[PDB]
Every structure is written in structure tokens, then in C-alpha cells.
């Protein structure tokens, strides 16, 4: 095959405001092959109830998926997306930064 | 504006036996309206938008029969391609397939598509005239010759220029309240002093639909690309999309820089300045 | 509306 590593973005559906309900998003794209392991983390620990979009692909045939879950951000709590893929030595953790 | 209907199919084989994964997604423009996923144990083509949900039981029965036929098609194709490439049953391989049609502002036919990839690279594609094929390698040439002799492109052209556009028009009418409206980007700019010597300007575009947008930076009215970063347009999860573009500027020279936004939902292109 | 015909690679 030809193997392509995922791009990863972690972000919220709406501009984040402490104490107000929101959605945490982990968008992975540009990867091949399609099998990929995506986890949303709260304070280093995997969130268990997570939804995802239906796998689709772009004009270069590379795949994309959205993983998301309900969350209420506080200023103390930390979030991240953890991604594993055959192109990665070990899982890549991308921290949620609300200005990004 | 213009509109499209597109179906995206992914088929992933599993070592030896074990059923392959099969997933089918249908879109109008950037709105998903149907899905079937073997990994989610689907048994029917399932609606994902209210304008398609109102279609009756004969419609859904028919789409369910056809999506099961596409699944079996791909099960054959995975076996066929292993033969063409002399590949063992132990490895995992991927077939992707996309097809559909574009219409214009008058909703008349613009272009049709029907194309395949194997293991992440082009395999065969219907050319723009919908009469001939581009084959990527020698295995695909076998497919091309077979499909030429059987007059496949002529059959597909009838679907692409006819059935597809005809059902797209119907979808666009039933979903007029959602499908035929645009959401202009909500834009703003942030300034983060990186050092005493530089500052990052980040130009944001939020809650827009369709996903197509352009964000570009200018320095004193010329296009500037060095010291810039541009992320992929990303889904918000509520049907809209987001994007940002950033540039690192010398502190004190913020006013040389302008962010430009083009989107189908805007009356005119936007110019944003840090001020 | 899916294609009603089948063509195999």
C-alpha cells in the first residue's frame, strides 16, 4: 500500500466558555489505511461515551473522521485527543487548546 | 449556486476469512443524508436528514436492496483485485469508490463522476466525457477492456446525466429550507504576542456552510504566504464548518496585514485588519 | 438514489 499519517485537530463545536455545555471534537484526516484508533481524554483518562461520524474520504482518497462528545469545560480540567495509526510509532496525544 | 449528489463507498478486507467492512455514505452538497455501515450492523439504508426521512417505504426498500447489492459487488471486487495483483488472503486491502453528479444554478447537468481507488491510489475513473476510462496500471487495464466491451460507460452515463440529476432536483426541492440556504462565516481576528519581537495574527471563520471557503493573508495588498499557517476546514459537528489561518508578523507591523475571506454565503469578500 | 445496475471490476 501507500501509507499516510493522520492530521489531527482538537477543538470545541462552539467557542469555549467555562461552565457552559459544549462539544469536544477530534477531527482526523488525510490518513491511509482507514483503520484508526481515536480516544478523547479528560485529565489523562479515556472518556467512555464518544460518538463519531461515518467514515468518508477526500479527493486524494485520504480518509477523515470526527470523534466528539458532550463536555462542560472548566478552567482546571484538561482535554486531549489520543490517536493511533499504523504510521505512528506510538499514540499521538494532542492537547485541547481553546485558542486553536 | 451549484449543487451535487455524491456517494462514497469504502470496503476493507480482513485477513483470511472474516467479512470485509463495507460503509456507504450519501451526501447532497456537504449534508450527509444516508448511511449504511457493516461495522455498525446496518440492515437498511438509513436516513440522516428530515427531507429524506419523509420518503415512503417503497423508496427505502429499494435503496436497501441496492446498497446490499453494492456491498456484494465490493466483496467480489476485493477477491478480484487480490487475483489481479497476485496478493495473499492474509493482508488487509481497501477499495474506495465515489460517484455522483453536479448541477448548476439552473439545476441543469454539469458533470458526472464514477471512480475507484485500490489501496489508497487511483485504479479506474470515468473520464469527463462519460464515454471512456482512465486506468492507472495494468490490472486496471483488464477492467477497462471488460467495461468497454460491455458498454458500461453508456449505461452509467444514462444514470449520471439522468436518474442522478433527476433525484438531486427532487431532494433539493424537498429540502429547500435547509439545502438551499447558506450560512456566511462569522469571522474575527486574535492577536497573541509570541515574543517582544513577533506576534501571531489568527483569522477565524466559524459556523459557515457549505464547507468551501478561502482564507488568505496579504501584506500591504500583496499576497503573503511565508510565516503563515493554514489548517484544514473542519466540521463543527452541527452541520457547519470552521477554519483558521495564521501569520507571524513583526511586532509593530500588524497594520501591514489583511485577512481575506471568500465564501458563497457572503455578499462580498471580507477584509479584516487587526485594529 | 443509488445506481440500480452492478458492474464488477
Residue numbers in the entry:
A (entry chain B): 0 to 99
B (entry chain A): 1 to 275
C (entry chain C): 1 to 9
What does the report in the manuscript say about this coordinate set?
Here we report crystal structures of one public and one private TCR (YLQ7 and RLQ3, respectively) from COVID-19 CPs in complex with HLA-A*02:01 and two S protein epitopes, corresponding to residues 269–277 (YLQPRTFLL; designated YLQ) and 1000–1008 (RLQSLQTYV; designated RLQ), that were found to elicit almost universal CD8+ T cell responses in HLA-A2*02:01+ CPs but not in healthy donors. Public TCRs are observed in multiple unrelated individuals, whereas private TCRs are distinct between individuals. For its part, the RLQ epitope, unlike YLQ, is conserved across human and zoonotic sarbecoviruses and is therefore a potential candidate for inclusion in a pan-sarbecovirus vaccine. The YLQ epitope has been identified as immunodominant in multiple independent studies, including one involving the BNT162b2 mRNA vaccine.
We determined the structures of the RLQ–HLA-A2 and YLQ–HLA-A2 complexes to 2.81 and 2.07 Å resolution, respectively. Clear and continuous electron density extending the entire length of both MHC-bound peptides allowed confident identification of all peptide atoms. Both RLQ–HLA-A2 and YLQ–HLA-A2 crystals contain two complex molecules in the asymmetric unit. By contrast, the YLQ peptide adopts somewhat different conformations in the two YLQ–HLA-A2 complexes, with an r.m.s.d. of 0.52 Å for α-carbon atoms and 1.51 Å for all atoms. The RLQ and YLQ peptides are bound in conventional orientation with the side chains of P2 Leu and P9 Val/Leu accommodated in pockets B and F, respectively, of the peptide-binding groove. In the YLQ–HLA-A2 structure, Leu270 serves as the P2 anchor residue and occupies pocket B of HLA-A2. In addition, superposition of the MHC α1α2 domains of free YLQ–HLA-A2 onto those of YLQ–HLA-A2 in complex with YLQ7 showed that TCR binding stabilizes the central portion of the YLQ peptide in a conformation intermediate between the two observed in the unbound YLQ–HLA-A2 structure, thus optimizing TCR interactions with both peptide and MHC.
